[PDB]
Amino acid sequence: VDIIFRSKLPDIYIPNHLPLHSYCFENISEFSSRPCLINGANKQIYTYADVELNSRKVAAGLHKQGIQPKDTIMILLPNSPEFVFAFIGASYLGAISTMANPLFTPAEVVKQAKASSAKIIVTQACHVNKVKDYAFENDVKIICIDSAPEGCLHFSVLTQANEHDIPEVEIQPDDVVALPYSSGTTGLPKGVMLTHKGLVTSVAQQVDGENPNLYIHSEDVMLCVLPLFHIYSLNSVLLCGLRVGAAILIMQKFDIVSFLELIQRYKVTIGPFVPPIVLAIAKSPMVDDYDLSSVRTVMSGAAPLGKELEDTVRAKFPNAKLGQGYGMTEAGPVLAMCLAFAKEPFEIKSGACGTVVRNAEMKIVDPKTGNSLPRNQSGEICIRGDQIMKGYLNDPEATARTIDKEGWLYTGDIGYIDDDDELFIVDRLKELIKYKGFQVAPAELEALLLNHPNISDAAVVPMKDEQAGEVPVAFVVRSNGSTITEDEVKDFISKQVIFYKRIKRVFFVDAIPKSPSGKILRKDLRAKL
Ligand SMILES: Nc1ncnc2c1ncn2[C@@H]1O[C@H](COP(=O)(O)OC(=O)/C=C/C2=CCC(=O)C=C2)[C@@H](O)[C@H]1O
Numbered sequence: 295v296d297i298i299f300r301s302k303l304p305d306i307y308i309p310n311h312l313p314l315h316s317y318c319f320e321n322i323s324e325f326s327s328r329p330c331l332i333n334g335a336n337k338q339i340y341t342y343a344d345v346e347l348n349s350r351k352v353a354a355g356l357h358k359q360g361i362q363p364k365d366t367i368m369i370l371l372p373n374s375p376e377f378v379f380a381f382i383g384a385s386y387l388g389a390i391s392t393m394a395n396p397l398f399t400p401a402e403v404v405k406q407a408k409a410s411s412a413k414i415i416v417t418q419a420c421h422v423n424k425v426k427d428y429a430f431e432n433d434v435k436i437i438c439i440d441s442a443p444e445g446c447l448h449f450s451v452l453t454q455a456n457e458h459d460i461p462e463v464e465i466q467p468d469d470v471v472a473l474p475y476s477s478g479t480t481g482l483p484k485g486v487m488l489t490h491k492g493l494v495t496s497v498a499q500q501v502d503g504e505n506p507n508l509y510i511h512s513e514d515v516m517l518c519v520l521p522l523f524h525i526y527s528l529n530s531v532l533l534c535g536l537r538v539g540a541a542i543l544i545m546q547k548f549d550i551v552s553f554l555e556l557i558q559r560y561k562v563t564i565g566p567f568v569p570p571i572v573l574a575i576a577k578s579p580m581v582d583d584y585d586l587s588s589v590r591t592v593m594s595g596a597a598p599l600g601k602e603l604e605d606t607v608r609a610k611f612p613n614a615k616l617g618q619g620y621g622m623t624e625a626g627p628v629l630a631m632c633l634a635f636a637k638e639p640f641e642i643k644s645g646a647c648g649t650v651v652r653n654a655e656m657k658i659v660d661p662k663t664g665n666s667l668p669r670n671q672s673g674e675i676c677i678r679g680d681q682i683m684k685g686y687l688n689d690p691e692a693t694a695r696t697i698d699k700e701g702w703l704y705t706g707d708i709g710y711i712d713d714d715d716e717l718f719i720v721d722r723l724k725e726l727i728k729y730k731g732f733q734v735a736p737a738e739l740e741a742l743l744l745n746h747p748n749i750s751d752a753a754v755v756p757m758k759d760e761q762a763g764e765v766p767v768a769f770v771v772r773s774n775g776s777t778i779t780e781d782e783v784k785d786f787i788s789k790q791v792i793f794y795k796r797i798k799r800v801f802f803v804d805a806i807p808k809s810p811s812g813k814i815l816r817k818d819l820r821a822k823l
């Protein structure tokens with residue numbers, strides 16, 4: 295029998311039959327006039343009424359541009375009001391947003407555009423070159439938020455549409471609304487189908503209930519420095535923020551001065567961070583010149599945090615409850631959330647990544663035997679609930695290997711749950727590398743390396759790094775007679791991938807250690823490194 299773990303919070307009613315926009319704006323009448331989005335770039339403020347109206351206008355505009363229910367748009371933008379309007383606009387149409395890092399290489403953007411069948415790409419003028427040829431050859435519309443080059447439209451073509459022209463639509467709970475990409479537990483990035491039902495469930499698990507797990511209210515100011523094109527910010531900052539009527543303070547890029555100035559100036563109360571930001575707060579001499587006493591909740595997620603950096607937060611944010619959230623794109627994303635963040639807070643331990651969310655089930659499974667494990671025993675973390683993905687787009691085989699027929703998602707993460715129902719992640723079974731919280735799929739890099747005429751075999755694994763958490767490193771077997779150097783391997787990769795996917799070290803070996811099936815012995819390589 296499976297040994298099942300649950301939240302210390304009771305299950306709540308979740309209205310996950312509601313479309314995502316209907317749910318997130320369910321209580322909008324209570325805070326219609328309140329600030330919703332604050333753009334750090336220009337200090338422009340949109341109210342809740344503004345954001346709902348602009349999203350509806352954009353929905354009508356997208357319809358006019360040919361977006362029908364179940365069609366997909368690609369958002370290729372930094373954090374911005376336009377990102378939000380495009381995302382919520384598509385939701386109103388029963389359509390799908392796929393989201394991508396605007397700093398991706400042309401090849402990376404186009405691969406995702408093709409895989410997702412995006413009909414429109416929403417971007418900035420400076421990135422049109424990345425997609426223009428592909429878009430022309432495939433009649434993909436390009437919409438620019440700043441200025442429109444030839445063969446492109448301006449975003450005003452969407453915002454100038456009449457909100458009353460949103461077509462009648464019957465959106466279903468299992469309809470897809472968001473399509474972030476993730477490599478999951480092995481292989482290449484895949485389209486994660488996140489549904490209305492799924493995202494409503496995930497948001498509710500965090501912010502709804504008499505005692506919400508993550509207590510945020512309509513007088514809070516939440517920093518949005520994490521990228522909205524990744525699921526952590528998209529769900530836990532934007533969607534959760536909207537649901538409770540919080541103000542969301544958007545930053546386009548991290549820089550330490552702007553970060554500190556915005557916190558102090560706007561009296562930021564919620565700080566959703568990742569470990570590199572925590573480390574920057576730890577190290578920067580200028581931090582002591584700022585008043586950070588407004589911050590009442592600091593969360594770290596996306597990568598392990600550690601003890602030294604937890605001490606940093608305590609010292610630098612004297613009024614804050616500090617803790618972690620643990621998510622995975624396929625999981626909706628939140629698996630566990632620090633109960634110190636609750637309206638009636640629970641005691642927590644350092645190094646814990648939270649307690650499994652309410653309205654969900656967790657088990658810990660031994661990879662060797664397949665047996666479910668009791669408390670205080672490490673194994674693979676698995677989760678079950680309405681919040682998880684529908685599956686991978688056009689990839690039932692990968693879906694079947696990732697979520698079983700009893701509804702269990704296998705995370706590829708190793709951890710244990712203690713007597714206080716606190717979850718600790720201790721290792722990663724899956725091949726995924728995390729650079730500053732960003733996914734680096736070694737299979738992608740390995741495919742590139744094997745394409746080189748002078749490389750016989752290759753394996754990409756994480757190496758521990760202070761600044762980035764992990765960096766990708768390559769073990770490379772040179773072809774016979776090859777003299778390819780570390781720098782030459784690095785340059786070959788660097789010309790083809792976004793910065794964070796870059797190989798930081800190459801180790802040249804005679805053979806890549808492999809299992810008798812033909813699979814890389816990655817744990818052995820990590821032990822060596
Ligand atoms: N807290 C964590 N500690 C150790 N590791 C963590 C943690 N959170 C995520 N990870 C790692 O990233 C993987 C998931 O990567 P992915 O990019 O798909 O998703 C994410 O990283 C999402 C994280 C997140 C979302 C919402 C939120 O509120 C708090 C955190 C996990 O399987 C695990 O290996």
Ligand SMILES: [Mg+2]
Pocket residue numbers: 311313464465466467
């Ligand atoms: Mg319906």
